[PDB]
Design a protein around this ligand. Structure first.
Ligand SMILES: NC(=O)c1ccc[n+]([C@@H]2O[C@H](COP(=O)([O-])OP(=O)(O)OC[C@H]3O[C@@H](n4cnc5c(N)ncnc54)[C@H](O)[C@@H]3O)[C@@H](O)[C@H]2O)c1
Ligand SMILES: NC(=O)c1ccc[n+]([C@@H]2O[C@H](COP(=O)([O-])OP(=O)(O)OC[C@H]3O[C@@H](n4cnc5c(N)ncnc54)[C@H](O)[C@@H]3O)[C@@H](O)[C@H]2O)c1
Ligand SMILES: NC(=O)c1ccc[n+]([C@@H]2O[C@H](COP(=O)([O-])OP(=O)(O)OC[C@H]3O[C@@H](n4cnc5c(N)ncnc54)[C@H](O)[C@@H]3O)[C@@H](O)[C@H]2O)c1
Ligand SMILES: NC(=O)c1ccc[n+]([C@@H]2O[C@H](COP(=O)([O-])OP(=O)(O)OC[C@H]3O[C@@H](n4cnc5c(N)ncnc54)[C@H](O)[C@@H]3O)[C@@H](O)[C@H]2O)c1
Ligand SMILES: NC(=O)c1ccc[n+]([C@@H]2O[C@H](COP(=O)([O-])OP(=O)(O)OC[C@H]3O[C@@H](n4cnc5c(N)ncnc54)[C@H](O)[C@@H]3O)[C@@H](O)[C@H]2O)c1
Ligand SMILES: NC(=O)c1ccc[n+]([C@@H]2O[C@H](COP(=O)([O-])OP(=O)(O)OC[C@H]3O[C@@H](n4cnc5c(N)ncnc54)[C@H](O)[C@@H]3O)[C@@H](O)[C@H]2O)c1
Lengths: 289, 289, 289, 289, 289, 289
C-alpha cells in the first residue's frame, strides 16, 4: 500500500515489481525527471509481456502489476503515502539530500528505509524527524527472497520489526545485520568480483575461464565476472571504494581494471558491454576476442 | 592409455574414478603400501554398488570400471604409463622426491601432472628432465567437471594442451591457468570463507545468519562458514597463509579467529566441531548458540 | 611582554590564564565578537572567584591576574603584542585568514605561534611575511606543564628558541618537535585509544575490562576508552584520519566502531553518550550491559 | 588451597608470593632441579627480611608467608594441588610437554593455568585431557593488582569463572580476555613504545623530549622509551613480532631502530644501555646527547 | 600535417617545437585568449635565438620553425587540423570540455591526443564522437625521444598505431602503454625519488650522499633527490598521490618530508630551494649542513 | 697497506682487483680451500688477458696487479693485515665464525670490514674485540667507484672515517650509511626492477617497451628489466625479501613473476634466460616474442 520507490533503475524496478506483485501495493516509481520514470515502468511492462510470450505468468496479472505502479516525479510519492524504499545513486550526499523531505512531506507516521548496499545507515538518517532503517534487496528483487535489515545507530527497534513484518508478508526472509561497510552479503560477494578482476588483469586466466571455473569448481550459478556485469560495474566499484574508505584497509582496494572499464562507460548489462558483449541474439561473448 | 595415480586418498580414488568411466584407460592406483591401494580400491567398489543398488548404473560397467583399476605401489606398476596424475601429501619435499623417483621409472614420453593446490608447480619439477604440468581436479573428481591446467614457468605449450586434450576426452571441462598462488578457484573461494570469519569475529552477524544470507542473496549452494567446515579449516588456513606468503599482501592475511580454532582441533566436519557442532543425529548446531 | 590570544574558548582561556599568572605578562583576549570575548573573560573570573573561596588563592592576586587580561577583538588590541598565540577553529583557512590579517596588524618583532594539533604549521603560514611556529598547549593550559614547540619547514632555529625561553618563562617545559602529524603526544596517545576500540569491537574484552586493565597493568591515570570520551570521539576520529591521510599508512586506520559512534552523535562526555553513558546523576556506566 | 607454581623465576617467585600472601594458601614452588627451586625461595625470603628491617611487614608474617611455600620437583609435590600456574620459559613446546606431564600426576579436579603472555593458550593445551586457562599475572605479581583471565577456543565458561573467584580471593581484579595476541595491555602498551621509537627514528623529537612529553602531556608515570628500557627491548621486539605474525597486519611492524638495538645487545636496563645509558651513579643519560 | 597544440605553457611550447622541427608540419598554438597565446610563441622565439647566438642552429631553420607555428584561438585555427595534442591544465573537467568543443570544431578524420601525465585517458574521452588516445611527451619535448602512447579502454588499436607512425615521422621512439596509473616511467621514476626522501627522513644517509650513491652506484646521470628538484617537488608529490589514489595501495604513500617541503614552497629549481639550495653561483648546495 | 680479502668469488676477486691496482696495496685472497683461492687468482689473471692483449695497462704494471694478489687461506696470511674485507657466503652464521677467529689472528690495529648487502653489520660483529664496519662494493668492484660505508649500532664514527680514507686512496667515493636494510642503492634500485616486473605482469607494457622507455625517458643507461637479468634475478628476489622481512611493510613485496622465474632457474645472464633470451651471438631477445 502506497510503497515509495525512489529511483527507477536496475533495482527500483525490482522493488516496485516485488511489492506490486502481491495483492495490493499501489507502488510509486519516481526518478530525476518524469520520462526516466515511465521509461523504467515501460521496461517493467515489456518484461511482463515478454513473460506471457513464454507463458510463465498470465496476462491479467501482468497489467494488474503495471497498473498498480504509477510513474512520475516525487509528486505522486510525497503525499504521505506509505513506507518508502530509496533506490538512488550509491552516494552519501544524494542519498541524504532526497531523504531530507521523504520524512518531511510524508507524515512522520511513515517508515523510511534505504536500499543502500554499503553506505552508513546512521549517516543517511542523521537529521530527520523520524528513524531511518535499512531494507536491502538483491537483484532481481522480485525473485530473490533475502532482505537485510540494518538498524541505525539510534534507530528505534520499532522501525526494525515493522519492516521485518513487511518483508515476511511479501514472501521474503528477513535477517537483521548490524551496521557496517557492505553489511554481510556485499562485503563477501563484491570482493569476489574484485578478485576475479585482479586474476584477469594479472594474466592468470581469461574471462570465460574465470567464470567457468567458479561455476564448475565451486557450483556457483554465475561466475564473478558474469555477476559483476549483472549488478553493474559502477555499483561494484562504488561498493569496493566504500569498503576501502570506511576501513582504511588496502585489502579492499578496487582492481584498476574495473575503474578503467567504469570510466569507459562499459558497466555491463545495462550498457551493453562489460567483461562480455551483449549481442542482440540474447547471446553473450567474452571481450577477450 | 595407462594412467598412474600416486596416492589413494580422497583425490586418489576420485581421479581414478574419473579416468575409469570411459574407455581402455587403465589406471594404476598406487600408494606407499599395497595394503592401502586395495583399501582405496575397496572404498571405490563399495560406493559403486552403493549406487548399482539404486537403479542408476548397470553393473556391467560398474565392473568393467572397477576391473580397469589395478592397485599397488609406484615402481611395481608405473613403468608403462603415459600420464602420471600424482595426488599426494601437500608437502614440497614428498612431491619432489616422488617425481624424482618416477622419472627414473616411467617411459620417457609419460607426462607428469600434479594435483596440488597451494604448491608451486614450477618448483615441483625443478630437478626433473621432462616437463611438469598442473592437473588440478576438484572434489569429487568423478562428477566435478572442472580441471585447472597449470602452466609452469618452463611448461612447454605442447604439454599444456595434451593435458587439455586428455581432460576433454574424459568429459572434463579444462581451463588454462598461468601459475599463481591459488590459481583461480581457491584464490577466490578461500578468501571468501576468510572474510566470513572476519564478519563473525567483528560481530556483524551470527554464524547461522551469515550462512543463510549467502544462500538467499547470492544463490550459493552452501554458506561460506558451512563450506569451511566441509573443506577443513586447516586446509583453508594453509591456503590463506600460502596466498599471504607468496604475495606479501596483507589483503590475504588469515582471520585470527580461524587460526584460533585450528589450534583447538576444531577443524570442522572431520573432527566433530567446526563453525558448527556436527552432532550424532546430524543436526548442525552453530557454536554461537 | 604583551601576548595576543586569538580565540576566547576553552584553550584561549587556559592560555590567557597561563600567561597572566606570571607578572609582567599582559594578555589581549580576542574572539569573533566583543561580547563573545568578554564572555571568555567573565568565565575566567568566575573560576578565580571559586578558587579564592576554597582557600587555594588569595583575592589580591586573583584580582591581579584578571586585571592583566583585557577582552575585545583583534585589530583593536593586538598591534603591540610581542607574542601571538592563536586558539581558533581547527580549520586551515580560518587560521590562514587570521594569520594573514595579523601580518599587517602586529609589529614586525611580534612572534606568530599557533596552538593547532592536527594542522600543518608549515602550510598555515605559507604567504606570511614572517615565520610561523607551533606552540601546542595541553588542556587545561594553565596547569599542564608541557608545551610542544613545533618547528615548520621554514621556521628559523632562533624563532624556536624564543618560544623555548617564553615557555620556561611561564614555568612550562618546552619539547621541540619537527613538524609531523600528531607531533609527539597525540601520535602516540590517539592510536592507543584507537587500539582499545579495535579490541572491544573484535570481542577481545568488555569496555570496563579494557579501561581498568590499562590503568592497573600500565598504571595509567585513565583508561583509553574513558579518555576517548573525555577528549571527544570526534576529536580522536579526526586525529586518526589526519594521521592516516598524511602518512598514507594503514597503520593509522580509524576503527570503524569509533566512526560508527561519531556518526550517531555519541561523542562522549559532551553528548552524554560514548563508550560510557554519562548519567544525569553524574555516574558513568559502561554501555556494554 | 594448594597452588603449584611451576618455574621458580621472576614471575613464579612473585606469583608464589601473591598466593602465600593469603592465610589458607599453600604454595609448591617447583623447577627443573630441586636445588634451583630452593634458590628461588631463598631470594623471596631475602626480599622479605629487607622488608622487615625496613618496618613495612612485621617479622611474624614473613616467616608465615615463607613457611607456606615448599620447593621441590613436579611429581613429589603437585599431586594433591588444586590449581596449577606455570611460569616456565616462554616456549610453546616447553609449556606443552610440562602440562602433559601434569595431566598424569595432578588430580582430575585440579585446574590448569599458564602465565604466558605471548603464546596461544589454546595451542598450549590442545592435547590435554582437561581444559586450560590463562592467568596472566603482572610483574611484580605480589603487588600488581591486574590478572588477565585468558579463555581459549575450548576453555569452558565455568573454568573462567573459578579463576576469577580465586583472583578476587587473593586480592586481585580479574579481567576476562578472549584469546587474542597481546590480550589487552601488551597489545596497547607495546605498540605505544614501538611508536615512540619510530618518532625518534624519523627525527620528530629527541629521546628525552619524547619521554617528558608523555609524562607531562599524558600524565604517564614513565616515558615510553624509558618503559621499553625497563621492560627490555628484546621482549618489546618479540611482542611486536607476535602481533605482526598472528595478524599479518603491517600496523604491528616493529621499528627497525629497535631491531638494530636488540641485535647490538642494547636491551635496556638489564644490559646498561638502551635508549638511555644507565650509569653506575644511579643516573640515566639518553643516547641522544 | 597540421597539428593543433592546445595549451601554450611549458609543455605546449616544447611539443609545438617538436612538431615544427620537421618540415611539412604546420602548428597552431592555442590558449584561452590570444595575447598569452602569442606570448607562448614569443617565449619560444627568444629561446631559439639564444642558440643561433652560440652557433647551434642557423637563422635559416630557427626562423622557419617559428613560421610553421601560428598562435591564436582554437575555433579560428583547428577546424582544418589532422592531429590534436592538448597540453592544458592537469584537471579532468577542463580537458573534458575542450575535447567537447574540438569534437565539433575539428574535421571528421582529425585525431585527438592528450599529453596528460596523471589523468585517465579513458575518462577524458568518455562521451566523444571519436576515439581518444594518449601521446605522452617528455620535457624537454623537442629533444627527448621517448613518446608514451596510451591506449584507453576504448581506444582502437588502429588509432594507436597511427600515433606510433606520427612519432617516428618526427624523430621519436614510441612505446605502447595500456592505460595505467603513471604509465611506465613515472610509475618507476617517481617512487624512486619518493624512496630517496624516505631514506633521508629516517636518517639512513645524507642528501649529498644519497645522490652520489645513485649516480655512482647505479650509473645514473642525476641523483634522485636532485632529479626531484629538477622535475619539481610539487609535481612529484602529485604523481605519488595519483598513484596512491588510483591503486589504493599503501605501497605508493608519499613521503611526508616531501609533502612538508611542498607546503613550505621549497619545490626545487623553480623556487631555488629543494633538497639542494640552488645558489647565486648556479652551483647546488645540500640543505643537510 | 696490506689487505685481507676473504672469499674468492665474483666479489672476492673483484675487491682483490680493486685494491691491488693502486701501488702499495698487497692483497691476501683467502678462501675456504687453497685450491679455490688459486681459482680466483686464475680467473683474475685469465681475464687480465683482456687488459694487455688490449694493452690499456703495460705489463710493467699489468702483472704488478696479479703479483700484488697472493693466494692462500685465512690463518696463514692475515696475521699482519691492515684491513679485513670479507666476501663469504651471504649467510649470517658463516660470517660471525669467520670474524670470530680473525679476531684472534689479526693484529690489534686491523680494521674489520664486511661486504654483505643484506645481512646486519651489527649482528655479525656482536661478540668481537673490535668494531665491525660495512664496506659495500658494487660489481664490478674494480670499475665501480662507489663505496657504501655501513655504520653499525656500536660502530664508531672514527672507524667510519678511515674506511672513507681508504676508499679515496683506492680512487673510490665513500658514502656513509647508517645500518638499514638495502642501504641506499639496493633500497632504491631493486624496487625499480621490482616495479618494472609488476608493470609487465599486469599487462601494462611489453618487456622491450619498458626497457627503452626507461632509457629514453629517464636517461638510464640500462632498462630496469635488463638490469635485473644483469644483476641476477635471484639476488633481486633475495633483496626484496630482505627488505620485506626487515621493515614488515608490504610496500617491499616481491613480484610473483620474479619469484616464478627464479623458481624456474631463469635467473638472467648467468643462466641464458631471464626477461631476455641471451644469444651466444652476444645479442638478446625479449621473451615476449
Ligand atoms: N545494482 C545492484 O545489484 C544493487 C544491489 C543491492 C543494493 N542496490 C542499491 O540500489 C541503489 C540503486 O542502484 P541500481 O542498482 O538500481 O543501478 P542504477 O544506477 O541504474 O539505478 C539508480 C536510479 O536511481 C535514479 N536516481 C538518481 N538520483 C535520483 C534522485 N535524486 N531521485 C530519484 N531518482 C534518482 C537514477 O536516475 C537511476 O535511475 C544503489 O545505490 C545500490 O546501493 C544495488
Ligand atoms: N578437496 C581437496 O582435498 C583438494 C582438492 C583439489 C586438490 N587438492 C590436492 O590433492 C592432493 C591429494 O590430497 P587428498 O585430498 O587426497 O588428501 P589425502 O591425505 O586423503 O590423500 C593422500 C593419499 O596419498 C598417499 N600418499 C602419501 N604420500 C605418498 C607417497 N609418497 N607415495 C604414494 N602415496 C602417497 C597417502 O597414503 C594417501 O592415501 C593434495 O595435494 C591436495 O592439495 C585436494
Ligand atoms: N584540549 C583541546 O581542546 C585541544 C588542546 C590542544 C590544542 N587544540 C587546538 O586549540 C585550538 C583552540 O580550540 P578550543 O579547544 O579552544 O575550542 P573552542 O571552540 O572552545 O575555541 C574556539 C574559539 O575561537 C573563536 N574564534 C574563531 N575564529 C576566530 C577568529 N578568526 N578570530 C578570533 N577568534 C576566533 C571562536 O569564536 C571560539 O570562541 C584548536 O585549534 C584546537 O585544535 C585544542
Ligand atoms: N615481566 C615478566 O617477566 C613477564 C610478565 C608476564 C608473564 N610473562 C611470562 O611468565 C613466564 C615466566 O617468565 P620469567 O621472567 O619468570 O622467566 P625466567 O627466565 O626468569 O625463569 C623461568 C623459570 O622457569 C624454570 N623452568 C623452565 N622450564 C621448566 C620446566 N619445564 N619445569 C619447571 N620449571 C621450568 C626455569 O628453570 C626458570 O627458573 C613466561 O611465560 C613469560 O612470558 C613474564
Ligand atoms: N614536464 C611536465 O610538466 C610534464 C611533462 C609530461 C606531460 N605533463 C602534462 O602536460 C600537460 C601540460 O603541462 P604544462 O607543463 O604545460 O603546465 P602549464 O600550466 O604551464 O600549461 C598550461 C597552459 O595551457 C593554457 N590553457 C589552460 N587551459 C586551457 C584551455 N582550456 N584551452 C587552451 N589553453 C589552455 C594555459 O593558458 C597555460 O598557458 C599536463 O597535463 C601535464 O600533466 C607535463
Ligand atoms: N652484485 C653482487 O655480487 C653483490 C654486490 C655487493 C656485495 N655483495 C656481497 O659480497 C659478498 C660476496 O658475493 P659473491 O657474489 O662474490 O659470492 P660467490 O657466490 O661468488 O662466492 C663467495 C666466495 O666466497 C668463498 N667463501 C665462502 N665462504 C667462505 C668462508 N667461510 N671462508 C672463506 N671463503 C669463503 C667462497 O669459496 C667463494 O669463493 C656477498 O656477501 C654479497 O652479498 C655481492
Amino acid at each position: 500500500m502506497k510503497i515509495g520507490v525512489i529511483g527507477a533503475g536496475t533495482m527500483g524496478q525490482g522493488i516496485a515489481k516485488a511489492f506490486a506483485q502481491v495483492e495490493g501495493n499501489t507502488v510509486a516509481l519516481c526518478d530525476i525527471k518524469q520520462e526516466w520514470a515511465e521509461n523504467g515502468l515501460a521496461k517493467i511492462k515489456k518484461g511482463y509481456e515478454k513473460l506471457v510470450a513464454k507463458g510463465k505468468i498470465p496476462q491479467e496479472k501482468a497489467d494488474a502489476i503495471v497498473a498498480a505502479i504509477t510513474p512520475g516525479l516525487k509528486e505522486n510519492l510525497c503525499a504521505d503515502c506509505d513506507l518508502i524504499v530509496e533506490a538512488a545513486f550509491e552516494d552519501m550526499k544524494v542519498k541524504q539530500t532526497t531523504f531530507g523531505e521523504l520524512d518531511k512531506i510524508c507524515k512522520p507516521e511513515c517508515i523510511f528505509a534505504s536500499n543502500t548496499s554499503s553506505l552508513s545507515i546512521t549517516e543517511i538518517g542523521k537529521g530527520l524527524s523520524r528513524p531511518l532503517v535499512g531494507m536491502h534487496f538483491f537483484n532481481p528483487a522480485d525473485r530473490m527472497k533475502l532482505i537485510e535489515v540494518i538498524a541505525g545507530c539510534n534507530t528505534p527497534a520499532e522501525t526494525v520489526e515493522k519492516i521485518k513484518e513487511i518483508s515476511v508478508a511479501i514472501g521474503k526472509n528477513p535477517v537483521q545485520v548490524n551496521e557496517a561497510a557492505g553489511f554481510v552479503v556485499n562485503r563477501i560477494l563484491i570482493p569476489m568480483i574484485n578478485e576475479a578482476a585482479f586474476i584477469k588483469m594479472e594474466g592468470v586466466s581469461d574471462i570465460a575461464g574465470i567464470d567457468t571455473a567458479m561455476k564448475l569448481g565451486a557450483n556457483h550459478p554465475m561466475g564473478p565476472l558474469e555477476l559483476g556485469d549483472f549488478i553493474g560495474l559502477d555499483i561494484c566499484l562504488a561498493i569496493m571504494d566504500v569498503l576501502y574508505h570506511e576501513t582504511g584497509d588496502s585489502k579492499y582496494r578496487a582492481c584498476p581494471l574495473i575503474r578503467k572499464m567504469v570510466r569507459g562507460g562499459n558497466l555491463g548489462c545495462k550498457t551493453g558491454k562489460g567483461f562480455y558483449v551483449y549481442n542482440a541474439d540474447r547471446t553473450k561473448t567474452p571481450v577477450d576476442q
